[PDB]
Amino acid sequence: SGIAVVAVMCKPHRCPHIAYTGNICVYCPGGPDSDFEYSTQSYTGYEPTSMRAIRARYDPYEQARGRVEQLKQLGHSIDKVEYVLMGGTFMSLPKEYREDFIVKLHNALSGFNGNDIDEAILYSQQSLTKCVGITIETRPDYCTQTHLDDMLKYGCTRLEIGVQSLYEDVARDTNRGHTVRSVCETFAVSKDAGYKVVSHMMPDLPNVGMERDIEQFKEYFENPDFRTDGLKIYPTLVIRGTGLYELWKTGRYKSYSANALVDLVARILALVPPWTRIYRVQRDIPMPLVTSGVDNGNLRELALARMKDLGTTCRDVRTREVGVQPDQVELIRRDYYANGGWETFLSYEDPKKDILIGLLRLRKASKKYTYRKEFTSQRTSIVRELHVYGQHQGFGTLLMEEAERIAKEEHGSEKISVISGVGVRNYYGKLGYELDGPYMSKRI
Amino acid sequence: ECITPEAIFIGANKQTQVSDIHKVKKIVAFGAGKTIALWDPIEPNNKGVYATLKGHEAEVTCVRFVPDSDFMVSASEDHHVKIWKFTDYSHLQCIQTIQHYSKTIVALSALPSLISVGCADGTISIWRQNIQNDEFGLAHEFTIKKGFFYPLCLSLSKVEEKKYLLAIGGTNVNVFIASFILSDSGIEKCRVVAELEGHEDWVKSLAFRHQETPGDYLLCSGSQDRYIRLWRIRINDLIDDSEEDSKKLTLLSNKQYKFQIDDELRVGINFEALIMGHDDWISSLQWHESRLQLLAATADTSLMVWEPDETSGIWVCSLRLGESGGFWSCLWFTHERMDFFLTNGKTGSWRMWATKDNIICDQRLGISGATKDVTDIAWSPSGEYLLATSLDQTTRLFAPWIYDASGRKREIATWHEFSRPQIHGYDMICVETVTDTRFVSGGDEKILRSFDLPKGVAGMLQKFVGIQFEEKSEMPDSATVPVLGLSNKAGSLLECPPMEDQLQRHLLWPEVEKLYGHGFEITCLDISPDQKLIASACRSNNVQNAVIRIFSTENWLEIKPALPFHSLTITRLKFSKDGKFLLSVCRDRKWALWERNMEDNTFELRFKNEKPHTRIIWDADWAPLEFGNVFVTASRDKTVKVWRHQKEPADDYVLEASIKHTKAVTAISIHDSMIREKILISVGLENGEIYLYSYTLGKFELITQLNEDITPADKITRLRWSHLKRNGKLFLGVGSSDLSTRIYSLAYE
Ligand SMILES: C[C@H]1O[C@@H](n2cnc3c(N)ncnc32)[C@H](O)[C@@H]1O
Ligand code: SF4
């Protein structure tokens, strides 16, 4: 089996930082103020997801339903689907459009027909084709206390922030619109609300040279400010109508050769700690559109082969699973400090074959943060995801048995709380948990 | 009185029980936005929708006729349940509104003198009619399972004296059946007695068949696993006794449920049949009045009849028809010898089919409408059609049907939809016609579009409407959809206005030119009387972009200078009745006026003002040259002011008189000619009232207010009179925010 990934795009709109800056990001292609016909921001219209959107005319009930039943004409036999939103700055849209968007995302699985956001998720809880999560990408200045609890009502569990640089000059000179000391503060309120925080990083930006790229990513996992649970490596591509195309035209910006770039990402993956995953090493842009930058579309395996003859194994949690039988497994945990709280990473491992079975995240709720009403009347601890691959069945109930014993004793908590998605709310109701708002919690 | 409702263009909702049908008289009532529309599908004319019903402040969900009475029960998303009753023969009124349940209504069913309401927290209620008045008191409510069971559909029937059976369904894989005995005061012994397993997904629709055989009838249970499982309910002394020592290896799936209601009426429910197919989820279920067929509507735009054929026993698909989206509701009725097949899709349009003896189906003229709000209206410059655009990515063409296929004048002229020129994905804010063959439109987009009328429509506008088109060997044919881009490409013997599938793809108009210049999404536009200059303005909140841009309609380029007056965003532009002047009406509570160079097409700011009104101003319109240089201005401060060019001190305009209304006036218009030295002005305000006035030099006159039964139900967006005058009657084009587009006639000598 597995998890079905259905990607939808919202209405093509303008970012909200075009007003007070004067324009959008230097490297961003596409959008309404471009030459691509009827394309969402940061897209070209020639992508296999972005071609299903234009034929659907961005109708969320008809875009998602055509994608779901397409994947079962191939015969994947889907019953657990995780939505992901992309394109634009979805939380910058008007409030009466965003809530009606998410409602028809749920109606394509349940069959309920209505417009109340507070009632559509209740019908979606007893659905049989169920939603395990919704990924919504946004900007770091749109994760305030007003926006983070709107995502809890929508059913969102994972959110993605474009960081793309850890230097102050790069976020200024590329007209990014925020500061790097501001994104390290909104990571803290997001992880204490219970979200899986994934960030985006971009090598080969302007004015960041070859050597500055490797101390950029060494800092990203040594500093306890960031230490997130995921990355999407997006190397810089020069596109036709972008802002950096004129820098390529007048000879004031040149890119990497495709022997030093694959050497770079063979060193970046060497520093990846075992609690984070690398979703993408490059993005799906058809190479006839791109002028300079990445030549081919096979940078993933060319990076794994380049670290074969360096002796270094990429210990990535996207790489280290069954995809070879364990025959045995141990229980280990890892403890790191991330941006205000004590994160732990429980997993079942084999140190010989280097393969993972299950994993879990858990966080002590800090005191400088955590504005939520349910997490203030007493000292609580937040479990953030459970993710078991595939007897080989009781790995879920073992990770919940251990995360609860470690919360009463070592955290000293009176309540444990889950950020389970709507379709998987019934798996926790059997284990003694009860719903209180967005969370599925229990007094210890 | 003098006014007469001519045309209602309303579009249905996307719920699975928006519609029902009365049995004796044949009236289709379908929920459509906040209103309840009424339509008569059988008549020598077609007439479209004839009446709507007001009262709800959210969208209408459930509509059901109480069988064998004069009532109708309705439901919506404003937490309320309303009861209707016939007043004379084809109109209704509310007599009771339920103020309960604190949540929306998702399911509804009806019997004589008893209804049943299901709401979105797991509560199933029973309401009962008492004696001495038409009032529904509450009888009993219960809950299957508190946090886990949520209803979707309900149905109930009777057995032999007072005992009823109700069939609950929703959100799980089982079907719940309850029972209750009636009494003189209310009901009692209301409990759940059965629990029907067999399905794999949710149960979306279920209905009872009428009791043809006394003591034996059927039960259909459609579901979301694409299956349409059936049941069969028998009675006392016919129980098919079993489980005896000479047992029959009962195959525990057919386990033959059995219970008692009180003591003297006991039933037996077994499994009968099981049908695959349907290719997708099924929406609605219908039985027949006399025979033994069954109608099913699915979510992949299909509609098929199921019939038990002889010499096999099993069910087989006899009649299947239908040509994305889905069919939501469906109805059956026989009129003289044949039966009719009607259903609705995602465009808010009613498809209709006729057949003879279940062999040869053919098309039939259905009605259509919009699904979201209607924004702008533009009549033809000759005035025989109008382009009504909407907020649901569509644009319509509404025109009368006077001459038939032979050529005789029909004794009643009705209004229909002939073309649907554009389907491309934007919200379609504004539109304006330039010629009888070309028009200029624009939505929430930084550019404007320009379309040409094709020959396949020019052939049938000349035939059915009866209007002359010369020089027809030039304009191209019609394409279907923009697939390699977003602009429209280039790409007989009909006897009726077209069906829905021709309106979706075979009737779009080709685009001639796409013109640039603004950079933000368009609010409104207007064109000169001499068809030489088009002007437009876009949405902003800044002084740098509040510029009227004027384009010459020959080369479709910009005219050199800008027009930098306003600050927020301009809400109205109109040229004069000649080409001399040009006013602008903005959101910054002030207006401006611009005069023409007449040889370089340049504009200069002449006559400004800074505090005309208290609140902001919406609409403006000019007066004809027989009356003088006069324009009128409406505004948010519930007043309307008429101003005249007079120059005793200097060259400026000053107000003459005004009225104060109850609500904020949003749309005004002046008829293009005058009637016995008096001009005709019609106004419209923020919650559906339409007043029309007569004015003569500082004195208004309330002619009449339009009746509340035929008015729109939300704010008026535009008002435009027609240029043509036929049979001594005028024509007004009305567009509002209750999803409707209306046309009124007005005879006035
Ligand atoms: C919306 C996502 O797209 C990525 N993104 C934006 N522009 C480019 C480019 N030229 N090359 C690669 N990735 C890009 C951003 O880093 C952001 O994470
Ligand atoms: S990068 Fe993100 S924000 Fe900057 S422009 Fe492209 S999309 Fe908009």
Q: Is residue B441 part of a domain?
A: yes
Per the structure block, which two tokens stand in for B261? 């209601």
Rounded distance between C-alpha atoms, residue B250 and residue B256, angstroms: 9
* Residue B320 and residue B441 in one domain: no
The DSSP element (H or E) to which A199 belongs, if any, is strand A196-201
Residue A216, classed as helix, strand or coil, is helix
Nearest CA among B308, B367, B318 for reference residue B496:
B367
Strands (DSSP E) along B209-312, which ranges?
216-222, 230-234, 257-260, 266-271, 282-287, 294-298, 303-308
Distance (angstroms) between ligand 1 centre and the Cα of A175 equals: 14
The parent domain of residue B243 ranges over 12-367
Residues from chain B that touch A110, judged by Cβ atoms under 8 A, are 202
Is the CB of B687 inside 8 Å of chain A's CB atoms?
A: no
* Nearest ligand to the C-alpha atom of residue A285: 1
* Nearest ligand to the C-alpha atom of residue A163: 1
* Residue B534 and residue B653 in one domain: yes
Rounded distance between C-alpha atoms, residue B308 and residue A10, angstroms: 47
Q: Which of residues 54-83 of A touch B (CB under 8 A)?
A: 55, 57-58, 62, 66, 69
Q: Is residue B216 part of a domain?
A: yes
In angstroms, the separation between the Cα of residue A314 and the nearest Cα of chain B is 44
In angstroms, the separation between the Cα of residue B171 and the nearest Cα of chain A is 6
Please give the DSSP secondary-structure letter assigned to residue A408: I
Other Cβ atoms less than 10 A from the Cβ of A96: the count is: 8
Q: Judge whether B8 and B50 are in contact, CB under 8 Å.
A: yes
* Nearest ligand to the C-alpha atom of residue A12: 2
Nearest residue in B to A33, CA atom: B519
Rounded distance between C-alpha atoms, residue B236 and residue A278, angstroms: 69
Among B315, B335, B367, give the residue marking a domain's end. B367
Is ligand 2 within 6 A of the CB of residue A28?
yes
Exposure pattern of B287-314 as b/e (b: 16+ CB <10 Å)?
Answer: bbeeeebbbbbbbebbbbbbeeeeeeee
Resolution for this model in angstroms, one decimal place?
3.3
Spell out the residues 6+ positions from residue A9 whose beta carbon is closer than 8 angstroms to its own: A40, A43, A49, A50, A53, A58, A63, A85, A86, A87, A88
Does A428 appear as a known binding residue? Answer: yes
* Residue B309 and residue B395 in one domain: no
Q: Is residue B706 part of a domain?
A: yes
User: Integer distance in angstroms from the first to the last C-alpha of chain A?
Assistant: 34
Distance (angstroms) between ligand 1 centre and the Cα of A234 equals: 6
The DSSP element (H or E) to which B442 belongs, if any, is strand B438-442
Write the residue in B15, B324, B485 that is nearest to A37 by C-beta: B485
- Chain A with chain B: Cβ pairs closer than 8 A: 50
Spell out the residues 6+ positions from residue B135 whose beta carbon is closer than 8 angstroms to its own: B96, B129
* Residue B185 and residue B263 in one domain: yes
Is ligand 2 within 6 A of the CB of residue A239?
no
Among B320, B349, B367, give the residue marking a domain's end. B367
* Residue B191 and residue B329 in one domain: yes
Rounded distance between C-alpha atoms, residue A131 and residue A156, angstroms: 10
Does A386 appear as a known binding residue? Answer: yes
Pairing of strands A230-233, A277-280: parallel
Residues in chain A, how many? 444
Binary contact (A122, B281; C-beta < 8 A): no
Pairing of strands B438-442, B448-452: antiparallel
Binding pocket residue ranges, ligand 1, CB within 6 Å: A 27-28, 42, 162, 164, 200, 202, 234, 236-237, 283
Last residue before each break in chain B (C–N > 2.5 Å): 323, 491
* Residue B345 and residue B374 in one domain: no
Q: Is residue B337 part of a domain?
A: yes
* Residue B503 and residue B404 in one domain: yes
Q: Which of residues 122-151 of B touch A (CB under 8 A)?
A: 148, 150
* Residue B403 and residue B336 in one domain: no
Rounded distance between C-alpha atoms, residue A205 and residue A217, angstroms: 14
Nearest CA among B141, B118, B116 for reference residue B127:
B116
For A92, phi then psi, to 5°, come to: -85, -10
CA dihedral B234, B235, B240, B241 (to 10 degrees): 140
SS percent in chain A: helix, strand, coil, step 5: 30, 20, 45
Among B335, B367, B399, give the residue marking a domain's end. B367
Ligand 2 atom closest to Cα of residue A162: 2
* Residue B266 and residue B254 in one domain: yes
For A103, phi then psi, to 5°, come to: -65, -45
* Residue B398 and residue B307 in one domain: no
For A305, phi then psi, to 5°, come to: -75, -30
Rounded distance between C-alpha atoms, residue A176 and residue A59, angstroms: 30
The DSSP element (H or E) to which A134 belongs, if any, is strand A130-138
Q: Is residue B479 part of a domain?
A: no
Q: Is residue B477 part of a domain?
A: no
Is the CB of B315 inside 8 Å of chain A's CB atoms?
A: no
Helical segments of B477-587, H only: 500-505
Nearest CA among B18, B41, B33 for reference residue B367:
B41
Rounded distance between C-alpha atoms, residue A104 and residue A115, angstroms: 8
User: Integer distance in angstroms from the first to the last C-alpha of chain B?
Assistant: 14
Rounded distance between C-alpha atoms, residue B280 and residue B264, angstroms: 43
Q: Is residue B490 part of a domain?
A: no
Q: Judge whether B49 and B5 are in contact, CB under 8 Å.
A: no
Q: At what angle do helices A212-222 and A260-268 cross, to 10 degrees?
A: 10
Rounded distance between C-alpha atoms, residue B461 and residue B419, angstroms: 10
Rounded distance between C-alpha atoms, residue B746 and residue A306, angstroms: 83
Is the CB of B171 inside 8 Å of chain A's CB atoms?
A: yes
* Residue B387 and residue B302 in one domain: no
What's the domain count of chain B? 2
Residue A95, classed as helix, strand or coil, is helix
Q: Is residue B488 part of a domain?
A: no
Residues from chain B that touch A35, judged by Cβ atoms under 8 A, are none
Per the structure block, which two tokens stand in for A371? 């504005």
Residues from chain B that touch A115, judged by Cβ atoms under 8 A, are 59, 77
* Residue B449 and residue B562 in one domain: yes
Q: Judge whether A284 and A299 are in contact, CB under 8 Å.
A: no
Write the residue in A112, A115, A128 that is nearest to B77 by C-beta: A115
Rounded distance between C-alpha atoms, residue A292 and residue A237, angstroms: 6
For A314, phi then psi, to 5°, come to: -75, 110
Pairing of strands B92-98, B105-111: unpaired
**Alpha carbon distances (Å) from B690 to B53, B383, B683:** 17, 22, 6
